[PDB]
Symmetry: C2
Subunit: 174 residues, 2 copies
């Protein structure tokens, strides 16, 4: 048998404007997607037998013109860095978002690199192997996804929460 309790994880979504952060959230939490306020959404799912309440934060679009404030990252245990596989610029900015996390987020936050818009294969600018190699180099989890076609969307969120739970537990047997 198992006891009746929940884990509270705060996750933040970061990345350049237009990479599909808000559509990743609406696809995972409400299964909706829009071709071009709601501060965060919560979905609860089972991770290795345990119930995990994931509170996933999303921007209001201010990252297009200014830097995200420190309060956005506070309390977050995981983070998704989203880029556009069809936009090189959005992939080059991954280092900037890594700087943002080191500067305002928890020192041991668990990071996952997400390559969104995998449906635009005719416009692919960033090869999967380049970003996958970069993720392992910087000890980030990695997947490509498509909020439009729902490919690997649940995988991007389940992979991070599963790694958070296991990395926490593994850290607990000190």
């Amino acid at each position: 048998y198992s006891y009746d309790y929940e884990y509270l994880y705060k996750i933040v979504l970061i990345g350049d404007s237009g990479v599909g952060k808000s559509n990743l959230l609406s696809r995972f939490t409400r299964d909706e997607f829009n071709l071009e306020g709601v501060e965060f959404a919560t979905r609860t799912l089972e991770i290795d037998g345990k119930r995990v309440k994931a509170q996933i934060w999303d921007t209001a679009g201010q990252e297009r013109y200014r830097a995200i404030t420190s309060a956005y990252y506070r309390g977050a245990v995981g983070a998704l860095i989203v880029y556009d596989i069809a936009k090189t610029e959005s992939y080059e900015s991954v280092s900037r978002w890594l700087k943002e996390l080191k500067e305002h987020a928890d020192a041991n936050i668990i990071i996952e690199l997400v390559g969104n818009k995998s449906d635009l294969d005719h416009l692919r600018a960033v090869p999967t192997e380049e970003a996958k190699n970069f993720a392992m180099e910087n000890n980030l989890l990695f997947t490509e996804a498509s909020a439009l076609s729902s490919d690997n969307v649940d995988l991007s969120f389940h992979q991070l929460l599963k790694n958070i739970y296991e990395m926490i537990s593994k850290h607990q047997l000190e």
Copy 2:
């Protein structure tokens, strides 16, 4: 170092009308007490290094005339059975509340017996040793408390949440 995450525990308060359930809640969550809606309150505190968000439920007084519905107990990991040390009847009803928990609450809910109104020592009807012996007999945690004078109030809630966390963890090394 420790990761940034929380545990969500639902706790319910049960006992006969007038034993001091609502005043136990206001004393622990808001440090207020009244001499003779708000469905539940949440207070977060540190249990053995970890952060535990306790959601403590309280009745609207319907237990005076009818039985508490099943939905009140659903999801609860712990429960406080409160009686009046100055009212024998309220102590005799502890078996009824144990029946209520077996009937509508989780099969492995952790129960604590609380003897409230310890300040009315001139009116003591239930000796501490009788209820303490009864609690160990039925594998309940036990303390006396006074919502009026704040004695053992934080102890009654901290003792239960600490036992819940450790009993869960101890159950986890299957």
